[PDB]
Amino acid sequence: ARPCRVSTADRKVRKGIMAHSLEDLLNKVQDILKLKDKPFSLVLEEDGTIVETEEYFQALAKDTMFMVLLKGQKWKPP
Amino acid sequence: ETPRARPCRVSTADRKVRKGIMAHSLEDLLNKVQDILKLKDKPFSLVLEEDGTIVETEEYFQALAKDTMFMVLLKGQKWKPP
């Protein structure tokens, strides 16, 4: 049961969220970050690498900054 | 090679799609990347996204940092500067 640091796409709000899995993370992120709708994609905040498997989500360091993307939203350089 | 798979960040040559892929070796990685990145055909070369350094041995692939961004090149594609 693990600690994730998660940003919105405009990087204005970053929050620490505990998750058992990628899917659990994705189920929590809307309420926590007060997203306008459900997330479409989870990406690495540093470079926009798409996190789309559980095994890859779990191999990343606990201090990894994640970014949620809603439909049509794209990762952008900080 | 590595009993436990290692996380790789992998870019297409146009840098529009970037994805985290788990891999046990260079060969395993190269076996996986076409379906994952939706490549039109099999990869020809794996390169460092940063400077186009060719990754062509398993030992060099394994020595790289986990956050290294890779780039796949298909036949006749060339690394280009970002």
PDB file of N, CA and C in Angstrom, chain B residues 7-81:
ATOM      1  N   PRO B   7      12.722  -1.039 -15.400  1.00  0.00           N
ATOM      2  CA  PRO B   7      11.912  -0.017 -16.049  1.00  0.00           C
ATOM      3  C   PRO B   7      12.684   0.836 -17.087  1.00  0.00           C
ATOM      4  N   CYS B   8      12.127   0.962 -18.298  1.00  0.00           N
ATOM      5  CA  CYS B   8      12.766   1.699 -19.399  1.00  0.00           C
ATOM      6  C   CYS B   8      11.761   2.717 -19.867  1.00  0.00           C
ATOM      7  N   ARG B   9      12.235   3.940 -20.137  1.00  0.00           N
ATOM      8  CA  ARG B   9      11.400   4.981 -20.685  1.00  0.00           C
ATOM      9  C   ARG B   9      11.755   4.972 -22.142  1.00  0.00           C
ATOM     10  N   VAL B  10      10.762   4.858 -23.017  1.00  0.00           N
ATOM     11  CA  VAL B  10      11.089   4.677 -24.444  1.00  0.00           C
ATOM     12  C   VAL B  10      10.246   5.585 -25.342  1.00  0.00           C
ATOM     13  N   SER B  11      10.950   6.347 -26.178  1.00  0.00           N
ATOM     14  CA  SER B  11      10.347   7.293 -27.116  1.00  0.00           C
ATOM     15  C   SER B  11      10.313   6.767 -28.568  1.00  0.00           C
ATOM     16  N   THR B  12       9.295   7.171 -29.326  1.00  0.00           N
ATOM     17  CA  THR B  12       9.329   6.927 -30.756  1.00  0.00           C
ATOM     18  C   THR B  12      10.250   7.967 -31.396  1.00  0.00           C
ATOM     19  N   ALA B  13      10.624   7.796 -32.668  1.00  0.00           N
ATOM     20  CA  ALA B  13      11.634   8.679 -33.251  1.00  0.00           C
ATOM     21  C   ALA B  13      11.119  10.117 -33.379  1.00  0.00           C
ATOM     22  N   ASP B  14       9.817  10.270 -33.588  1.00  0.00           N
ATOM     23  CA  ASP B  14       9.243  11.632 -33.709  1.00  0.00           C
ATOM     24  C   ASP B  14       9.009  12.289 -32.325  1.00  0.00           C
ATOM     25  N   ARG B  15       9.274  11.507 -31.276  1.00  0.00           N
ATOM     26  CA  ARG B  15       9.120  11.934 -29.869  1.00  0.00           C
ATOM     27  C   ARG B  15       7.689  12.286 -29.513  1.00  0.00           C
ATOM     28  N   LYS B  16       6.709  11.717 -30.199  1.00  0.00           N
ATOM     29  CA  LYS B  16       5.347  12.062 -29.836  1.00  0.00           C
ATOM     30  C   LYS B  16       4.730  11.110 -28.813  1.00  0.00           C
ATOM     31  N   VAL B  17       5.206   9.865 -28.808  1.00  0.00           N
ATOM     32  CA  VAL B  17       4.762   8.837 -27.849  1.00  0.00           C
ATOM     33  C   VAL B  17       5.948   8.317 -27.037  1.00  0.00           C
ATOM     34  N   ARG B  18       5.768   8.360 -25.708  1.00  0.00           N
ATOM     35  CA  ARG B  18       6.793   7.976 -24.777  1.00  0.00           C
ATOM     36  C   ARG B  18       6.149   7.056 -23.756  1.00  0.00           C
ATOM     37  N   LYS B  19       6.728   5.873 -23.534  1.00  0.00           N
ATOM     38  CA  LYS B  19       6.072   4.935 -22.650  1.00  0.00           C
ATOM     39  C   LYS B  19       7.029   4.153 -21.777  1.00  0.00           C
ATOM     40  N   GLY B  20       6.579   3.822 -20.564  1.00  0.00           N
ATOM     41  CA  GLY B  20       7.358   3.015 -19.617  1.00  0.00           C
ATOM     42  C   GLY B  20       7.189   1.527 -19.899  1.00  0.00           C
ATOM     43  N   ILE B  21       8.286   0.815 -20.159  1.00  0.00           N
ATOM     44  CA  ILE B  21       8.198  -0.581 -20.542  1.00  0.00           C
ATOM     45  C   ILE B  21       9.106  -1.341 -19.611  1.00  0.00           C
ATOM     46  N   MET B  22       8.642  -2.488 -19.128  1.00  0.00           N
ATOM     47  CA  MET B  22       9.470  -3.324 -18.270  1.00  0.00           C
ATOM     48  C   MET B  22      10.305  -4.292 -19.105  1.00  0.00           C
ATOM     49  N   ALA B  23      11.601  -4.467 -18.815  1.00  0.00           N
ATOM     50  CA  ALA B  23      12.399  -5.343 -19.670  1.00  0.00           C
ATOM     51  C   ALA B  23      13.505  -6.077 -18.936  1.00  0.00           C
ATOM     52  N   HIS B  24      13.779  -7.306 -19.363  1.00  0.00           N
ATOM     53  CA  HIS B  24      14.791  -8.118 -18.718  1.00  0.00           C
ATOM     54  C   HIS B  24      16.145  -7.979 -19.397  1.00  0.00           C
ATOM     55  N   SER B  25      16.160  -7.489 -20.645  1.00  0.00           N
ATOM     56  CA  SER B  25      17.368  -7.306 -21.441  1.00  0.00           C
ATOM     57  C   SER B  25      17.074  -6.344 -22.587  1.00  0.00           C
ATOM     58  N   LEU B  26      18.130  -5.946 -23.296  1.00  0.00           N
ATOM     59  CA  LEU B  26      18.041  -5.207 -24.518  1.00  0.00           C
ATOM     60  C   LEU B  26      17.195  -5.957 -25.550  1.00  0.00           C
ATOM     61  N   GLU B  27      17.503  -7.239 -25.715  1.00  0.00           N
ATOM     62  CA  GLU B  27      16.745  -8.059 -26.678  1.00  0.00           C
ATOM     63  C   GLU B  27      15.249  -8.144 -26.318  1.00  0.00           C
ATOM     64  N   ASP B  28      14.962  -8.334 -25.047  1.00  0.00           N
ATOM     65  CA  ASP B  28      13.570  -8.360 -24.571  1.00  0.00           C
ATOM     66  C   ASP B  28      12.876  -7.031 -24.866  1.00  0.00           C
ATOM     67  N   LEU B  29      13.560  -5.927 -24.552  1.00  0.00           N
ATOM     68  CA  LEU B  29      13.054  -4.609 -24.816  1.00  0.00           C
ATOM     69  C   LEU B  29      12.726  -4.459 -26.289  1.00  0.00           C
ATOM     70  N   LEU B  30      13.666  -4.819 -27.136  1.00  0.00           N
ATOM     71  CA  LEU B  30      13.459  -4.691 -28.570  1.00  0.00           C
ATOM     72  C   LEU B  30      12.355  -5.583 -29.106  1.00  0.00           C
ATOM     73  N   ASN B  31      12.131  -6.704 -28.420  1.00  0.00           N
ATOM     74  CA  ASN B  31      10.990  -7.583 -28.709  1.00  0.00           C
ATOM     75  C   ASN B  31       9.644  -7.047 -28.356  1.00  0.00           C
ATOM     76  N   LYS B  32       9.622  -6.076 -27.443  1.00  0.00           N
ATOM     77  CA  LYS B  32       8.378  -5.559 -26.856  1.00  0.00           C
ATOM     78  C   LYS B  32       7.881  -4.250 -27.481  1.00  0.00           C
ATOM     79  N   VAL B  33       8.801  -3.489 -28.023  1.00  0.00           N
ATOM     80  CA  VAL B  33       8.581  -2.083 -28.276  1.00  0.00           C
ATOM     81  C   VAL B  33       7.598  -1.789 -29.429  1.00  0.00           C
ATOM     82  N   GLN B  34       7.614  -2.646 -30.462  1.00  0.00           N
ATOM     83  CA  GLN B  34       6.678  -2.491 -31.559  1.00  0.00           C
ATOM     84  C   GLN B  34       5.206  -2.529 -31.122  1.00  0.00           C
ATOM     85  N   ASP B  35       4.771  -3.551 -30.388  1.00  0.00           N
ATOM     86  CA  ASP B  35       3.346  -3.591 -29.990  1.00  0.00           C
ATOM     87  C   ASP B  35       3.032  -2.422 -29.060  1.00  0.00           C
ATOM     88  N   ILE B  36       3.983  -2.123 -28.177  1.00  0.00           N
ATOM     89  CA  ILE B  36       3.746  -1.111 -27.122  1.00  0.00           C
ATOM     90  C   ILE B  36       3.651   0.310 -27.667  1.00  0.00           C
ATOM     91  N   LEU B  37       4.528   0.644 -28.593  1.00  0.00           N
ATOM     92  CA  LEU B  37       4.614   1.992 -29.129  1.00  0.00           C
ATOM     93  C   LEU B  37       3.777   2.095 -30.452  1.00  0.00           C
ATOM     94  N   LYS B  38       3.222   0.974 -30.908  1.00  0.00           N
ATOM     95  CA  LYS B  38       2.392   0.935 -32.132  1.00  0.00           C
ATOM     96  C   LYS B  38       3.260   1.271 -33.352  1.00  0.00           C
ATOM     97  N   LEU B  39       4.437   0.660 -33.415  1.00  0.00           N
ATOM     98  CA  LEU B  39       5.412   0.985 -34.456  1.00  0.00           C
ATOM     99  C   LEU B  39       4.943   0.331 -35.733  1.00  0.00           C
ATOM    100  N   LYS B  40       5.142   0.963 -36.881  1.00  0.00           N
ATOM    101  CA  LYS B  40       4.691   0.369 -38.154  1.00  0.00           C
ATOM    102  C   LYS B  40       5.439  -0.921 -38.553  1.00  0.00           C
ATOM    103  N   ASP B  41       6.619  -1.157 -38.002  1.00  0.00           N
ATOM    104  CA  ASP B  41       7.394  -2.340 -38.292  1.00  0.00           C
ATOM    105  C   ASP B  41       8.387  -2.502 -37.139  1.00  0.00           C
ATOM    106  N   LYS B  42       9.214  -3.541 -37.232  1.00  0.00           N
ATOM    107  CA  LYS B  42      10.153  -3.941 -36.184  1.00  0.00           C
ATOM    108  C   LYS B  42      11.246  -2.900 -36.015  1.00  0.00           C
ATOM    109  N   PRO B  43      11.772  -2.765 -34.786  1.00  0.00           N
ATOM    110  CA  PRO B  43      12.862  -1.797 -34.596  1.00  0.00           C
ATOM    111  C   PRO B  43      14.181  -2.223 -35.251  1.00  0.00           C
ATOM    112  N   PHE B  44      14.950  -1.251 -35.720  1.00  0.00           N
ATOM    113  CA  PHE B  44      16.273  -1.460 -36.315  1.00  0.00           C
ATOM    114  C   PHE B  44      17.380  -1.107 -35.297  1.00  0.00           C
ATOM    115  N   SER B  45      17.119  -0.115 -34.464  1.00  0.00           N
ATOM    116  CA  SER B  45      18.160   0.420 -33.605  1.00  0.00           C
ATOM    117  C   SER B  45      17.553   1.007 -32.315  1.00  0.00           C
ATOM    118  N   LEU B  46      18.272   0.889 -31.200  1.00  0.00           N
ATOM    119  CA  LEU B  46      17.896   1.599 -29.985  1.00  0.00           C
ATOM    120  C   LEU B  46      18.972   2.600 -29.669  1.00  0.00           C
ATOM    121  N   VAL B  47      18.530   3.813 -29.379  1.00  0.00           N
ATOM    122  CA  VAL B  47      19.418   4.935 -29.279  1.00  0.00           C
ATOM    123  C   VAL B  47      19.076   5.773 -28.013  1.00  0.00           C
ATOM    124  N   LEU B  48      20.002   6.591 -27.504  1.00  0.00           N
ATOM    125  CA  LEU B  48      19.657   7.480 -26.412  1.00  0.00           C
ATOM    126  C   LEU B  48      18.923   8.663 -26.953  1.00  0.00           C
ATOM    127  N   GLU B  49      17.770   8.933 -26.355  1.00  0.00           N
ATOM    128  CA  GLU B  49      16.943  10.017 -26.830  1.00  0.00           C
ATOM    129  C   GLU B  49      17.688  11.365 -26.755  1.00  0.00           C
ATOM    130  N   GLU B  50      18.528  11.511 -25.735  1.00  0.00           N
ATOM    131  CA  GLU B  50      19.295  12.739 -25.483  1.00  0.00           C
ATOM    132  C   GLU B  50      20.311  13.162 -26.600  1.00  0.00           C
ATOM    133  N   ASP B  51      21.044  12.220 -27.182  1.00  0.00           N
ATOM    134  CA  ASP B  51      22.174  12.529 -28.039  1.00  0.00           C
ATOM    135  C   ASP B  51      22.380  11.489 -29.167  1.00  0.00           C
ATOM    136  N   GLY B  52      21.517  10.479 -29.232  1.00  0.00           N
ATOM    137  CA  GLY B  52      21.603   9.523 -30.337  1.00  0.00           C
ATOM    138  C   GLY B  52      22.719   8.492 -30.152  1.00  0.00           C
ATOM    139  N   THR B  53      23.277   8.420 -28.963  1.00  0.00           N
ATOM    140  CA  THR B  53      24.200   7.289 -28.695  1.00  0.00           C
ATOM    141  C   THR B  53      23.597   5.895 -28.940  1.00  0.00           C
ATOM    142  N   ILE B  54      24.270   5.043 -29.725  1.00  0.00           N
ATOM    143  CA  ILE B  54      23.702   3.759 -30.043  1.00  0.00           C
ATOM    144  C   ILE B  54      23.841   2.802 -28.864  1.00  0.00           C
ATOM    145  N   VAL B  55      22.732   2.167 -28.500  1.00  0.00           N
ATOM    146  CA  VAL B  55      22.763   1.116 -27.448  1.00  0.00           C
ATOM    147  C   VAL B  55      22.729  -0.229 -28.134  1.00  0.00           C
ATOM    148  N   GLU B  56      23.845  -0.946 -28.108  1.00  0.00           N
ATOM    149  CA  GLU B  56      23.955  -2.159 -28.908  1.00  0.00           C
ATOM    150  C   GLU B  56      24.524  -3.338 -28.162  1.00  0.00           C
ATOM    151  N   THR B  57      24.732  -3.149 -26.873  1.00  0.00           N
ATOM    152  CA  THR B  57      25.139  -4.286 -26.055  1.00  0.00           C
ATOM    153  C   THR B  57      24.340  -4.321 -24.810  1.00  0.00           C
ATOM    154  N   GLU B  58      24.143  -5.546 -24.337  1.00  0.00           N
ATOM    155  CA  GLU B  58      23.338  -5.741 -23.120  1.00  0.00           C
ATOM    156  C   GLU B  58      23.956  -5.075 -21.860  1.00  0.00           C
ATOM    157  N   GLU B  59      25.270  -5.111 -21.778  1.00  0.00           N
ATOM    158  CA  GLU B  59      25.963  -4.563 -20.630  1.00  0.00           C
ATOM    159  C   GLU B  59      25.832  -3.023 -20.601  1.00  0.00           C
ATOM    160  N   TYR B  60      25.960  -2.369 -21.745  1.00  0.00           N
ATOM    161  CA  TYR B  60      25.732  -0.926 -21.794  1.00  0.00           C
ATOM    162  C   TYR B  60      24.267  -0.580 -21.496  1.00  0.00           C
ATOM    163  N   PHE B  61      23.336  -1.380 -22.007  1.00  0.00           N
ATOM    164  CA  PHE B  61      21.949  -1.127 -21.751  1.00  0.00           C
ATOM    165  C   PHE B  61      21.666  -1.163 -20.226  1.00  0.00           C
ATOM    166  N   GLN B  62      22.176  -2.202 -19.554  1.00  0.00           N
ATOM    167  CA  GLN B  62      22.041  -2.382 -18.104  1.00  0.00           C
ATOM    168  C   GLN B  62      22.767  -1.323 -17.250  1.00  0.00           C
ATOM    169  N   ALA B  63      23.857  -0.728 -17.737  1.00  0.00           N
ATOM    170  CA  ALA B  63      24.561   0.276 -16.934  1.00  0.00           C
ATOM    171  C   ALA B  63      23.871   1.613 -16.887  1.00  0.00           C
ATOM    172  N   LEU B  64      22.917   1.827 -17.786  1.00  0.00           N
ATOM    173  CA  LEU B  64      22.245   3.128 -17.807  1.00  0.00           C
ATOM    174  C   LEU B  64      21.282   3.383 -16.659  1.00  0.00           C
ATOM    175  N   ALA B  65      21.163   4.650 -16.247  1.00  0.00           N
ATOM    176  CA  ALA B  65      20.169   4.985 -15.212  1.00  0.00           C
ATOM    177  C   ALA B  65      18.725   4.667 -15.640  1.00  0.00           C
ATOM    178  N   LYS B  66      17.928   4.293 -14.642  1.00  0.00           N
ATOM    179  CA  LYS B  66      16.532   3.912 -14.825  1.00  0.00           C
ATOM    180  C   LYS B  66      15.743   5.023 -15.501  1.00  0.00           C
ATOM    181  N   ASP B  67      16.130   6.274 -15.281  1.00  0.00           N
ATOM    182  CA  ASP B  67      15.380   7.388 -15.885  1.00  0.00           C
ATOM    183  C   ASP B  67      15.894   7.780 -17.254  1.00  0.00           C
ATOM    184  N   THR B  68      16.841   7.016 -17.810  1.00  0.00           N
ATOM    185  CA  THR B  68      17.330   7.233 -19.191  1.00  0.00           C
ATOM    186  C   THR B  68      16.183   7.134 -20.173  1.00  0.00           C
ATOM    187  N   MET B  69      16.037   8.141 -21.033  1.00  0.00           N
ATOM    188  CA  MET B  69      15.062   8.083 -22.120  1.00  0.00           C
ATOM    189  C   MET B  69      15.671   7.456 -23.378  1.00  0.00           C
ATOM    190  N   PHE B  70      15.083   6.337 -23.852  1.00  0.00           N
ATOM    191  CA  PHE B  70      15.560   5.663 -25.061  1.00  0.00           C
ATOM    192  C   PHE B  70      14.758   6.139 -26.262  1.00  0.00           C
ATOM    193  N   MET B  71      15.275   5.863 -27.464  1.00  0.00           N
ATOM    194  CA  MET B  71      14.534   6.176 -28.695  1.00  0.00           C
ATOM    195  C   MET B  71      14.649   4.994 -29.609  1.00  0.00           C
ATOM    196  N   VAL B  72      13.510   4.535 -30.154  1.00  0.00           N
ATOM    197  CA  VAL B  72      13.620   3.466 -31.117  1.00  0.00           C
ATOM    198  C   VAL B  72      13.673   4.029 -32.529  1.00  0.00           C
ATOM    199  N   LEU B  73      14.518   3.438 -33.338  1.00  0.00           N
ATOM    200  CA  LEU B  73      14.594   3.825 -34.734  1.00  0.00           C
ATOM    201  C   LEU B  73      14.202   2.639 -35.571  1.00  0.00           C
ATOM    202  N   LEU B  74      13.327   2.885 -36.531  1.00  0.00           N
ATOM    203  CA  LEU B  74      12.970   1.855 -37.513  1.00  0.00           C
ATOM    204  C   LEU B  74      13.976   1.978 -38.651  1.00  0.00           C
ATOM    205  N   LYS B  75      14.023   0.959 -39.512  1.00  0.00           N
ATOM    206  CA  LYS B  75      14.827   1.013 -40.729  1.00  0.00           C
ATOM    207  C   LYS B  75      14.903   2.394 -41.351  1.00  0.00           C
ATOM    208  N   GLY B  76      16.133   2.919 -41.446  1.00  0.00           N
ATOM    209  CA  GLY B  76      16.352   4.185 -42.139  1.00  0.00           C
ATOM    210  C   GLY B  76      15.951   5.479 -41.441  1.00  0.00           C
ATOM    211  N   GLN B  77      15.360   5.393 -40.245  1.00  0.00           N
ATOM    212  CA  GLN B  77      15.112   6.553 -39.392  1.00  0.00           C
ATOM    213  C   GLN B  77      16.414   6.962 -38.757  1.00  0.00           C
ATOM    214  N   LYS B  78      16.555   8.254 -38.503  1.00  0.00           N
ATOM    215  CA  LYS B  78      17.783   8.730 -37.904  1.00  0.00           C
ATOM    216  C   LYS B  78      17.408   9.493 -36.658  1.00  0.00           C
ATOM    217  N   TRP B  79      18.280   9.464 -35.656  1.00  0.00           N
ATOM    218  CA  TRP B  79      18.102  10.288 -34.493  1.00  0.00           C
ATOM    219  C   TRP B  79      18.254  11.751 -34.956  1.00  0.00           C
ATOM    220  N   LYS B  80      17.384  12.621 -34.439  1.00  0.00           N
ATOM    221  CA  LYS B  80      17.477  14.044 -34.698  1.00  0.00           C
ATOM    222  C   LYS B  80      17.437  14.807 -33.378  1.00  0.00           C
ATOM    223  N   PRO B  81      18.105  15.963 -33.329  1.00  0.00           N
ATOM    224  CA  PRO B  81      18.145  16.724 -32.074  1.00  0.00           C
ATOM    225  C   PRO B  81      16.778  17.242 -31.665  1.00  0.00           C
TER     226      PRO B  81
END
